[PDB]
């Protein structure tokens, strides 16, 4: 060389992926609570009912369309990967 | 944003070249396990809570605000009805008292 060097980062890629997985598990099992203190477990349909209530739609709308809503969510997550791969 | 936890208020204090904010935050503690269901079925119609969650302590069902345990008897005032009770998953059965009946005016 001529005096130029690239130093490595402190957190390797694996450890960053571990932090990300921690955030996912927390948000899936305990909702927002894990960010405010002790993580409290709550069933996932009830968590989404909470959030539906949060945007001004009564929760009976979620319990009556759980099947349809789950299918739409699965389809959207499925098309995300295809879009990322086909997009140049 | 204003400290870790549910934010209550903040007080500023001067410093030689900046500010020092004393954020006052509310943090829960001493949690406890409970069994729950998304709706109660009474008289063939499904009931949902206006505010709170249906929490059971093993033998009795109650409604309680989400962030602090304060169980109350399930009544027509703190729940609302929507359609028959066969479409919802996880529905349970229980008596939903109506306060006008005991008075019998
Ligand atoms: C806050 C609390 O006590 N949560 C309990 C945990 O202690 C226990 O290990 C687990 C399995 O029994 O069920 C839940
Ligand atoms: C297992 C348990 O805690 N059961 C209690 C019961 O003893 C009490 O009489 C009732 C009324 O508060 O609430 C419930
Ligand atoms: C999950 C549940 O509560 N199921 C009961 C069912 O066992 C009973 O036969 C019916 C009669 O009202 O009420 C409902």
From Swiss-Prot, chain B:
Protein encoded by which gene: S
Disulfide bonds: 41-85
Effect of residue 60 to Y: In strain: Theta/P.3
Superkingdom classification of source: Viruses
Lineage, top ranks: Viruses, Riboviria, Orthornavirae, Pisuviricota, Pisoniviricetes
Protein function: Subunit of the fusion protein that is processed upon entry into the host cell. Mediates fusion of the virion and cellular membranes by functioning as a class I viral fusion protein. Contains a viral fusion peptide that is unmasked after S2 cleavage. This cleavage can occur at the cell membrane by host TMPRSS2 or during endocytosis by host CSTL. In either case, this triggers an extensive and irreversible conformational change that leads to fusion of the viral envelope with the cellular cytoplasmic membrane, releasing viral genomic RNA into the host cell cytoplasm.
Protein name in the entry: Spike protein S2'
Residues of the full protein shown: 1042 to 1146 of 1273
Glycan-linked positions: 33, 57, 93
Effect in UniProt of substituting residue 77 to H: In strain: Alpha/B.1.1.7
């Amino acid at each position: 060389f001529n005096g130029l060097t690239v130093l490595p980062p402190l957190l390797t890629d694996e450890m960053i992926a571990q932090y990300t997985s921690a955030l996912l598990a927390g948000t899936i099992t305990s909702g927002w609570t894990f960010g405010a203190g002790p993580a409290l477990q709550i069933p996932f349909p009830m968590q989404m009912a909470y959030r539906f209530n949060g945007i001004g739609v009564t929760q009976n709308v979620l319990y009556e369309n759980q099947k349809l809503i789950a299918n739409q969510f699965n389809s959207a997550i499925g098309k995300i990967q295809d879009s990322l791969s086909s997009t140049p | 944003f204003c400290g870790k936890g549910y934010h209550l208020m903040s007080f500023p204090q001067s410093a030689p070249h900046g500010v020092v904010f004393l954020h006052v935050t509310y943090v829960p503690a001493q949690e406890k396990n409970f069994t729950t269901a998304p709706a109660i079925c009474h008289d063939g119609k499904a009931h949902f809570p206006r505010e709170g969650v249906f929490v059971s302590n093993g033998t009795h069902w109650f409604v309680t605000q989400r962030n602090f345990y304060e169980p109350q008897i399930i009544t027509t005032d703190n729940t609302f009805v929507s359609g028959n009770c066969d479409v919802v998953i996880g529905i349970v059965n229980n008596t939903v008292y109506d306060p006008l009946q005991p008075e019998l005016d």
